[PDB]
């Protein structure tokens, strides 16, 4: 999942970034803190996805 | 008898702090020597 969002305009990729930041990050971290989280690779993969989305945003917007 | 050393953070920082060292040209040379030697603590700081 690296080129799927490379053809998505600024607004929709920004919406996807907002969704990834709001869900699958706060819920996962609070579940981990409270001990309710069983799978930890979710945090790593979602963080990597957020980083990739930010990189795509930087590449597209501006230059 | 009161011993020679009376601790004071303000005095220590203003006498041997990094900014005090950089204020004078020679202190920059002292910092360069410390960096070349490789000591972890270049100067005294909190």
């Amino acid at each position: 999942m690296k080129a799927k969002e490379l053809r998505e305009k600024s607004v929709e990729e920004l919406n996807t970034e907002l969704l990834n930041l709001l869900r699958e990050q706060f819920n996962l971290r609070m579940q981990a803190a409270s001990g309710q989280l069983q799978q930890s690779h979710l945090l790593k993969q979602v963080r990597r996805d957020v980083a990739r989305v930010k990189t795509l945003l930087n590449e597209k917007a501006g230059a | 008898m009161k011993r020679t050393f009376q601790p004071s953070v303000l005095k220590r920082n203003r006498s041997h702090g990094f900014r005090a060292r950089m204020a004078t040209k020679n202190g920059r040379q002292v910092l360069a020597r410390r960096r070349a030697k490789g000591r972890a603590r270049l100067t005294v700081s909190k």
């Binding site: 907002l18 930041l21 709001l22 990050q25 706060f26 971290r29 609070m30 981990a32 803190a33 409270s34 | -």
Partner: protein
Amino acid sequence: MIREERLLKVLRAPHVSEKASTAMEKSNTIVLKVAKDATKAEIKAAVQKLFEVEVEVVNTLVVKGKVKRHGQRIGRRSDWKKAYVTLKEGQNL
């Protein structure tokens, strides 16, 4: 804008302790860990946006790390900030 992302970034995780439970059951306050800066206004906005609740006032404090010696090697834990968000008469969690 990135105000919303700052709100969704300031909060880190909740805190659990006997004092936390006592404050929640008596004072209607929840203590949670926050970012290093985590200013009061940003924390208030973030909690209002996330928990869809109402908070009377928020106060925070900085908890200094501990010096622990693993084997012969000493080390200081990373300092973290905790905030007691006080809810009004209407609380959910």
